Amino acid sequence: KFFSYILVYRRFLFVVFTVLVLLPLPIVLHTKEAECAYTLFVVATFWLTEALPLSVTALLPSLMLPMFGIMPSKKVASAYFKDFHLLLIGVICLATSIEKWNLHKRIALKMVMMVGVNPAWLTLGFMSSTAFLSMWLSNTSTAAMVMPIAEAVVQQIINATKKGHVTRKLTCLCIAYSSTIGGLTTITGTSTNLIFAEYFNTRYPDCRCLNFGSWFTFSFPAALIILLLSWIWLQWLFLGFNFKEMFKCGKTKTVQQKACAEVIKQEYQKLGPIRYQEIVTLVLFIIMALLWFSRDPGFVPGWSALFSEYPGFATDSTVALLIGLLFFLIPAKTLEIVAFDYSPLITWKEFQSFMPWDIAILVGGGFALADGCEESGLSKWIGNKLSPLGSLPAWLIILISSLMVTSLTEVASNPATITLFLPILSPLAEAIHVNPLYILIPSTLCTSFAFLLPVANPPNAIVFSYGHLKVIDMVKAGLGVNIVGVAVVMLGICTWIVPMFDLYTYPSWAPA
Amino acid sequence: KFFSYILVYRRFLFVVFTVLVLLPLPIVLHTKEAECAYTLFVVATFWLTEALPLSVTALLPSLMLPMFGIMPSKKVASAYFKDFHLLLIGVICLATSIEKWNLHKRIALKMVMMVGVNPAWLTLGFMSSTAFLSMWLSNTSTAAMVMPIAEAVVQQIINAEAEVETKKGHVTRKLTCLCIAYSSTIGGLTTITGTSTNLIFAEYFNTRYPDCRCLNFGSWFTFSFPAALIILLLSWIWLQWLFLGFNFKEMFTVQQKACAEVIKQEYQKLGPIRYQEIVTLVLFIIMALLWFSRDPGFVPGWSALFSEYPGFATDSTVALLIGLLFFLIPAKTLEIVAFDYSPLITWKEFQSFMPWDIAILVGGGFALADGCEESGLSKWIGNKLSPLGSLPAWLIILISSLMVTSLTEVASNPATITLFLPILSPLAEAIHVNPLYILIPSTLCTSFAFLLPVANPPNAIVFSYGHLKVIDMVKAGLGVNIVGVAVVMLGICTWIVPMFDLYTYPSWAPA
Ligand code: NA
Ligand code: NA
Ligand code: NA
């Protein structure tokens, strides 16, 4: 009669309880650190439990910080839009054109035709293609783009069910994990790397280490090993290894194999000859990638030397916008008889869909919360309280931080997790007198390792929404993939990250 | 077969032509302020003739300014989100619940039964109500609170025009949009706290001239209300003529009652007011009460409770505080109850119905205005006004008013006056005629931003309703701006000089 109503209004009562129980913290401490800690705790509680929508919670700092007097609303509003958002707009413009003109379908079908219908090699081909695509596009868009095609290919291979369901589960999980793994290789690949680069360059403006080439040259060896080991782990866990049928060349002819291959060939033929919209989209994709790579990598100043009087004004977001806004200008189809006009090959109505406005607001809210934590002085207090932790061995601190971030990223979004630890792990670095990158790189790499739960990151939810995967089947694979990723990151940090970044000494661009 | 190809691909060719033909401007002319002028000209050309979508054009400053070296891309990006965007998020959270539970339909159908089936007087009633509301709350807030109600009224009248048995509806919708957008005359000019432009002018005047205590409530109203009422009436007549026919006969009936019966039938079809609609209406009233009671000027508001962090909490804070309650207040319930409840609005229902077009458009306008400040293009234009001491008394007034009302069409009203006011005050002190005589017309004409909806936030909330034709807005804005400038000049010439003594040099101004 009374307890029944409590379990129905769980979210409302939990939000009210969270707001009221943490109230004694700023009510009687009369410090800005306490008020910002109250705001941080409320935002973290609502992001972890998802009592409110993530983007609604991200708007709380713009409501609490101005009222607590920590920083004016004009200053909070200026932190909701950064170069991350411009890059996201420019890349969503490209992704909308790829999705609209079925270029991804052509690439996926050609990859399936070239690799074959062997379930051991088909999964590797899908993972490689999805990881390469996620190297440039966002993980969420890559997962939402490849998966509808992977399922379509798999269900037509099965038709041409003790083995079908496990095959579709394996295909779901391989795409979900490969999007994330491929997003690690580049700064622009995922939102976590973009947020980390923005925070690192704002907090340490005297460091010129993080560019495209330097990030790639250490994130590719780790990501390739992680991808190969995850493919092996998934193949063993779901289907198992049959080496004789796998390593054999095209010599044993089976009727049901060409029966499956003919369906894929007929689908690719029904796709039709390549249209010029697909060619233009592919050319613009290649140009965007080449301009991202051509901005100074370290050995040759590609086109940053062209603007070598305003350093740092034109960035990768400028390249993304320049390429993406061309998708609003290049004509695609006509309609003269009626309207005497053309179509711009991407309409703004089509761009407004598929554009992650919620992710933009979430990242802006995280950046505003970090700015409030820096302005109020909470970051300095946290760094001072973690000063005695500097007597421990260095590697243990990085291991513990990476494990904590990895554990907390399985239930909270990657952009939220990375924004709640950079203002904590960054001040902690100089409280030990150790290179901040030596802690930040493993932490930002382990923030992306979100494979256990569907709520961990949008790539997991997109794949889980198809209903093929159970929670336990996903957790079993995510545990192994996450262990592989953490082991590879820690091996790289101890082996090949320290020569190029010189992590064993204290840098000259860090505060003393 | 060539002329047809040129005519069909006219937008692409025009974009390329206008990018390439203004290209001599940055390469020549010292390459310092001509780059931002080139960017401004290209963006304005794309805005006037919609060769590209307005939100795509607004993203051009994020490209052109960083590449020209005017300002870094990090600084340009931060300009696409300000307090206008927080206020817009809050008011759209309110409006999503207003339109989801059909509260706008109840209000529209009650107003149609009560006042104004005739569109001619309905437009006047809408303009008068919006202009009275804008005297107290804000211009942006007022253009956002009443616009859904006006759209609902027009849509209900269009539906009821079936008479139980499409050109006029579209022009009526355009007229109702522009009348709400342009109703900044009585509200926003007659009170210091009506708009931020008058607040900035008052704070600058009381600081630079602390011996002059003439500017306050009442004295501002006494000289501004006569001008604002004439501007409102003339703008109503101009809009009625521009969008509707010249109606003269019947204003000195089966069709009216044929629609009144349909309105009555559609009002009783709604039924009793629901819980969700009551909650939405209560939050609507609370948001307006908190906007009004922040700092009314004639009595301390709740901003006095925060008299340690002045200006940290704005109207955007109120909008967020009220709008974020729509995501947690229960609306419906999902042995009878299955597992939980649902909120008034969800994020899926908010992401749609959100003018993401207007957010980017206003952000691009803000970025272009900031780029015009980083590179001293706006400072150059303002400094082209100072060497005009030869003009005896009034040509300076006219030139300054025209320059400010032309530059306010691309920059925000606060930023437009913040530039010219410290330029006009020294010019008015170099001459010996009453710096108020110089500053009042320019302050009034700064708010006359009726062209280019990118400038005035009231012009963008209205523009966010699907009537995306800038030229239909340009035609009306030109006439409204001309009327406003003429009425301001008439007021300066006739009725403002007695109460401020504008024909003699005062004692509170430096000699
Ligand atoms: Na990616
Ligand atoms: Na995560
Ligand atoms: Na106003």
Ligand code: NA
């Ligand atoms: Na303006």
